[PDB]
Write a protein that binds this ligand. Structure first.
Ligand SMILES: *[C@@H]1O[C@H](CO[C@@H]2O[C@@H](C)[C@@H](O)[C@@H](O)[C@@H]2O)[C@@H](O[C@@H]2O[C@H](CO)[C@@H](O)[C@H](O)[C@H]2NC(C)=O)[C@H](O)[C@H]1NC(C)=O
Ligand SMILES: *[C@@H]1O[C@H](CO[C@@H]2O[C@@H](C)[C@@H](O)[C@@H](O)[C@@H]2O)[C@@H](O[C@@H]2O[C@H](CO)[C@@H](O)[C@H](O)[C@H]2NC(C)=O)[C@H](O)[C@H]1NC(C)=O
Ligand SMILES: *[C@@H]1O[C@H](CO[C@@H]2O[C@@H](C)[C@@H](O)[C@@H](O)[C@@H]2O)[C@@H](O[C@@H]2O[C@H](CO)[C@@H](O)[C@H](O)[C@H]2NC(C)=O)[C@H](O)[C@H]1NC(C)=O
Ligand code: A1IYP
Ligand SMILES: *[C@@H]1O[C@H](CO[C@@H]2O[C@@H](C)[C@@H](O)[C@@H](O)[C@@H]2O)[C@@H](O)[C@H](O)[C@H]1NC(C)=O
Ligand code: SIA
Ligand code: NAG
Ligand code: NAG
Ligand code: CL
Ligand code: CL
Length: 527
């Protein structure tokens, strides 16, 4: 029986057996008033103390969200879908502490991804008990609001000011600040990490002034705020908040009477209508997301980045080899997970229209021209592989690289990885490669469980990554020093060195996707 006194009351945890040892899990600790009723769309309000012993012995409700129902019964898709009841009452967090209770442990805070539209901390691949067990860190994860319910914006209007899901996250970091010492954690040694929209979130916390002092270091996996999907324009955010009001019959002249009306809709009505607030959706549409609210974000993040207006600290940043392939089977014609997806030139061109719907003919012609100068025009996988790189290079790799140059240019140490191992248990087809999101189980140390059908070389790779991530959190330096591991050099804007992560050989390489990212980061923004 392990009871910890938090500032808001006592919480009871449970005991786990991990690898012939013990982790104490506290699952589902509330960190805010439930954002219900008049509280829907407003910033999260602080929690009133309780007198009982709160029982933190199972994962809490996931936040309301639309579900990937594209591949029913397929583990490759459904593993990302919520594994707890959806509810608007979802502002809860989890804590894994090592046993015995540590003395002053480094804290890892996980922020999940999902396009700011989907996700939950209770997913199996976000289980923090292995990290607690193996590296003696405390792992914290939190649920934050998503979709319109977390990112609707009438900017300047406190009834729907925007960025609430980011303020959810921030209130969770604040909770760790006031309470993790009671769990044996060091509030002065808190490393944020997250993937995709989680990584975009971590990166905005580097920019937000109200987060500066709620963490120490940052890890960005497959995501950053400067990615083209990450920050909604304050124009579009208003156009989208208005389109939802018309779709639900809530159109009013007094913008506040609009919020009141949207607050008497059932969550299902708000959810079914989110996809239509944009005129041309894509598999990557962030219908409702981060915006420049004047509160969490004070200026356009590109400006802040360029002019050195962020928290000065170390960053670990990285991307996977085939970031784009996942999205191709969600709309791109000629694509399927259930065949090799050889597409034609004309099918490739049609794919650009799906992914670049508001881009000019010349801009689409320009993606085609820089990605279809073939070595061997006769290879039939040419066009299929070109469309995946187009989506991955544009949406993930090039902004992640451009974020790391810009950030390091202001003096801080930066470390960049290129994860190029395809999980031996991966359920998607092989042409899909080293997919978006399939480094996460390695970061969380799931291949360390021998019962889990991973190969031994995978257990070695996960163990090494877990050491590197924990040494970055503890010491700012993501080395593995005992076994004769490749030393991981700092990413400088001059030489641009990065580390490959694979089961075979860990190499140091230079200037990733250099020809591709010159197109994306210089030419393409002008179109
Ligand atoms: C909170 O938990 C206490 C302690 O019980 C523990 O947690 C439970 C979820 C279960 O797994 C138990 O086996 C654990 O030991 C609960 O205390 C029990 O309360 C009921 C009715 O109130 C009583 O009949 C039992 O004898 C109590 N003790 C045990 C060991 O069951 C308490 O009820 C829980 N409260 C809430 C709000 O969930
Ligand atoms: C800003 O919003 C208008 C209106 O959105 C339309 O109506 C909403 C209620 C919702 O159902 C959306 O899906 C609709 O698109 C947009 O105007 C539309 O633009 C498309 C082409 O871009 C056109 O075919 C529609 O007929 C237009 N509808 C109306 C009522 O004017 C407008 O494009 C949005 N602005 C941006 C920058 O996307
Ligand atoms: C690969 O599959 C796609 C998807 O089509 C569906 O899934 C298949 C696996 C099979 O079960 C079909 O019955 C389904 O239609 C194929 O794309 C379709 O292609 C046909 C003819 O080319 C076209 O009429 C449809 O519009 C396409 N549908 C979509 C959603 O794009 C594709 O042709 C297959 N290619 C190869 C090389 O296997
Ligand atoms: C509807 N979604 C997208 C579908 C395609 C991927 N599918 C989950 C998955 C993940 C990994 C491997 C296989 C399947 C869900 S989404 O999660 O809401 C979303 C929306 C916008 C985004 C913009 C940028 C980056 C990520 C984004 C995610
Ligand atoms: C490091 O490697 C271990 C197994 O290798 C053996 O033990 C190490 C400590 C060296 O003495 C080496 O000569 C041996 O061959 C793993 O058990 C251990 O988990 C690894 N650690 C990390 C962080 O990857
Ligand atoms: C998930 C949710 O929304 N509510 C509650 C669930 C379900 O309502 C019931 O199990 C019926 O499904 O049950 C609890 O009350 C329980 O007694 O364990 C906990 C939780 O708060
Ligand atoms: C924890 O570590 C910090 C330094 O990082 C130190 O100032 C603090 O006093 C320590 N507290 C405990 C309880 O060990
Ligand atoms: C909108 O309605 C609310 C509630 O009735 C009121 O407080 C606010 O002043 C109104 N604003 C305008 C511009 O009418
Ligand atoms: Cl050709
Ligand atoms: Cl060019």
């Amino acid at each position: 029986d392990i009871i910890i006194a938090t500032k808001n009351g006592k919480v009871r945890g449970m005991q786990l057996t991990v690898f012939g040892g013990t982790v104490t899990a506290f699952l589902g600790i509330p960190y805010a008033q439930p954002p219900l009723g008049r509280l829907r769309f407003k910033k999260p309000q602080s929690l009133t103390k309780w007198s009982d012993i709160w029982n933190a012995t199972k994962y809490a409700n996931s936040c309301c969200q639309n579900i990937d129902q594209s591949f029913p019964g397929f583990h490759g898709s459904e593993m990302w879908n919520p594994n707890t009841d959806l509810s608007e009452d979802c502002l809860y967090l989890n804590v894994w502490i090592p046993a015995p209770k540590p003395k002053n442990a480094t804290v890892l805070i996980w922020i999940y991804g999902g396009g700011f539209q989907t996700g939950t901390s209770s997913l199996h691949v976000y289980d923090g008990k292995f990290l607690a067990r193996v590296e003696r860190v405390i792992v914290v994860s939190m649920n934050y609001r998503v979709g319109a319910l977390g990112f609707l914006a009438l900017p300047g209007n406190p009834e729907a000011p925007g960025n609430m899901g980011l303020f959810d996250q921030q209130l969770a970091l604040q909770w760790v600040q006031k309470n993790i010492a009671a769990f044996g954690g060091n509030p002065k040694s808190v490393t944020l990490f997250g993937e995709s929209a989680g990584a975009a979130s971590v990166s905005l916390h580097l920019l937000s002034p109200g987060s500066h002092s709620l963490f120490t270091r940052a890890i960005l996996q497959s995501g950053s705020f400067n990615a083209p999907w990450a920050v909604t324009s304050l124009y579009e955010a208003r156009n989208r908040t208005l389109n939802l009001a018309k779709l639900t019959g809530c159109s009013r002249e007094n913008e506040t009477e609009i919020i009141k009306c949207l607050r008497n809709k059932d969550p299902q009505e708000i959810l079914l209508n989110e996809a239509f607030v944009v005129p041309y959706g894509t598999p990557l549409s962030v219908n409702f997301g981060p915006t420049v609210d004047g509160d969490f974000l004070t200026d356009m993040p590109d400006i802040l980045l360029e002019l050195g207006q962020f928290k000065k600290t170390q960053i670990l940043v990285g991307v996977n080899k085939d970031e784009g392939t996942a999205f191709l089977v969600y709309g791109a014609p000629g694509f399927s997970k259930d065949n090799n997806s050889i597409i034609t030139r004309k099918e490739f061109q049609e794919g650009l229209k799906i992914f670049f719907p508001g881009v000019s003919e010349f801009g689409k012609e320009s993606i085609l021209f820089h990605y279809t100068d073939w070595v061997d025009d006769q290879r039939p996988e040419n066009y299929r592989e070109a469309l995946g790189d187009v989506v991955g290079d544009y949406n993930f790799i090039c902004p992640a690289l451009e974020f790391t140059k810009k950030f390091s240019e202001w003096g801080n140490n930066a470390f960049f990885y290129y994860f190029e191992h395809r999980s031996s248990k991966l359920p998607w087809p092989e042409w899909m490669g080293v997919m978006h999101g399939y480094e996460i189980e390695f970061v969380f140390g799931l291949p360390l469980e021998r019962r889990d059908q991973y190969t031994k070389a995978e257990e070695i790779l996960s163990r090494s990554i877990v050491k590197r991530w924990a040494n970055f959190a503890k010491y700012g330096n993501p080395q593995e020093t005992q076994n004769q591991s490749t030393s991981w050099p700092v990413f400088k804007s001059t030489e641009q060195k990065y580390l490959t992560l694979n089961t075979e050989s860990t190499r140091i390489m230079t200037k990733l996707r250099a020809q591709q990212c010159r197109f994306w980061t210089s030419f393409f923004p002008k179109v």
